[PDB]
């Protein structure tokens, strides 16, 4: 009726709750991770201190730190600083911490601006096909990988049936799951995401064959003109010819 | 570094250690007859868990020290302080005082 | 609520025998950890983590099992192994002891 858990467990049970806190997934384990904490740590564990701790990390980030994302100028061994392998064991997660430009890179979204007119637009797009405001396509025919870096986080490009790795200045990890591309938030005064990230599909895998991106392009716009445009694209990455 | 408790009567304690700050403290009794049953622990934080056979009838340092309701004689025992070494792998109490034998009459 | 339950209670060996005695959970759990006792003196942790000597111990004890059975295993018996020996397992909470076995020397 009742489970008592492992160092490891209950540290990878800390990392899902992180994670899911991330908005990186949408399931967490989190039993046993009371006592876990009462036992290993000394301290309770409830939403406030998992927030603070996110803030401290990606944030206020000053000195060393624990596996535990505790900082200070069982769980005494304080490392230096570059990353963190944030591994709950369904889902793994290599964060980086503040670095003094982090502040800028970070944009903050807690109210979206407006939604931006529609306009007509193919659906039959290419990755050839270049001009959005939104996109930035990458092609090395050298080690046969696409990738696909963008400028506004805010809008989504869902993935389908792809296996693709995103790159960031926040956290960098690996997506299969199908649906939209699963971002970093982090709260403090407020919700921050990042900047911009990186997508990279390897080609010359076999799993990313029948990969489509389904996103919004942005194209630019009288009587007042600077409207800002949005169409649905069908980005194909199929290597079948 | 080895653990040393304080034998006694009780109507129907203290173990002195050699951290507290570090160290979850056990408690372990044997019923005369080689029997054994868990009580408790209290970690370094001060936060509690019991044994729901003992109906939270039951436990609470500066300078190393641990202490200790409607005693039965079924509570005849031989008493035993135990620490938690934690690693990937839990409990394994490897250091035990010898123990006090209490006699409920 | 989680009771252990090792068999042989009670066994015999002639020294330098190989022994084996068993450790059966009600459920299956992750390890499990053995301490021997010697009568009249405070238990010893013997082998923890299923079969992870303590230090100190020779190397003729070892561990094994899995699920909800597991062993103690001596190569060689000896002298000072009469005794007796409890398995206790993790992911109880309700944590919970077997009843013991005691060994003697049949010399």
């Known amino acids: 009726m009742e489970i008592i858990l492992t160092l490891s467990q209950g540290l990878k049970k800390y990392y899902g709750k992180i994670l899911k806190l991330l908005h990186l997934t949408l399931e967490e384990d989190t039993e046993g991770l009371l006592e876990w904490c009462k036992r290993n740590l000394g301290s309770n564990c409830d939403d406030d201190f998992f927030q603070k701790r996110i803030e401290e990390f990606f944030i206020t980030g000053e000195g060393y730190f624990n596996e535990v994302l505790q900082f200070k100028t069982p769980f005494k061994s304080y490392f230096a600083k570059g990353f963190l392998s944030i591994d709950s064991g369904y889902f793994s997660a290599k964060c980086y911490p503040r670095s003094s430009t982090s502040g800028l890179q970070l944009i903050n979204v807690t109210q979206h601006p407006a939604r931006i007119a529609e306009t007509p637009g193919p659906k039959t797009t290419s990755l050839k096909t270049i001009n959005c405001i939104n996109l930035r396509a990458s092609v090395f025919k050298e080690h046969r990988e696409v990738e696909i870096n963008v400028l506004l986080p805010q809008i989504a490009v869902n993935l389908s049936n792809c296996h693709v790795v995103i790159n960031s200045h926040v956290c960098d990890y690996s997506l299969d799951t199908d649906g939209p591309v699963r971002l970093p938030r982090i709260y403090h005064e407020g919700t921050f995401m990042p900047g911009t990230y990186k997508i990279v599909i390897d080609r010359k895998n076999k799993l990313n064959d029948r990969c489509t991106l389904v996103t919004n392009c942005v194209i630019k716009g009288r009587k007042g003109q600077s409207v800002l445009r949005q169409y649905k694209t069908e980005i194909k990455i199929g290597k079948a010819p | 570094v080895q653990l040393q408790q304080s034998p006694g009567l009780v109507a129907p304690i203290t173990c002195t250690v050699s951290?507290?700050?570090?160290?979850?403290i056990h408690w372990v009794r044997q019923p005369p007859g080689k029997g054994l049953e868990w009580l408790g622990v209290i970690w370094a934080g001060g936060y509690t868990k019991y044994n729901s056979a003992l109906m939270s009838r039951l436990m609470s340092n500066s300078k190393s020290q641990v202490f200790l309701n409607s005693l039965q004689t079924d509570d005849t025992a031989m008493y035993y302080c135990?620490?938690?070494?934690?690693?990937?792998?839990?409990?394994?109490?490897?250091?035990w005082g010898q123990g006090t034998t209490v006699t409920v009459s | 609520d989680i009771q252990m339950t090792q068999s042989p209670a009670i066994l015999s060996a002639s020294p330098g025998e190989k022994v084996t005695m068993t450790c059966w959970a009600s459920?299956?759990?992750?390890?499990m950890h053995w301490y021997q006792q010697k009568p009249g003196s405070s238990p010893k942790p013997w082998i923890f983590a299923t079969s992870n000597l303590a230090s100190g111990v020779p190397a003729r004890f070892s561990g094994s099992g899995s699920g909800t059975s597991y062993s103690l295993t001596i190569s060689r018996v000896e002298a000072e192994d009469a005794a007796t020996y409890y398995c206790?397992?993790?992911?109880?909470?309700?944590?919970?002891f077997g009843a013991g076995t005691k060994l003697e020397i049949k010399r």
């Open positions: 459920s299956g759990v992750s390890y």
């Open positions: 951290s507290l700050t570090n160290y979850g």
């Open positions: 206790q397992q993790w992911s109880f909470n309700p944590l919970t």
């Open positions: 135990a620490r938690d070494e934690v690693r990937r792998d839990y409990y394994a109490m490897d250091h």
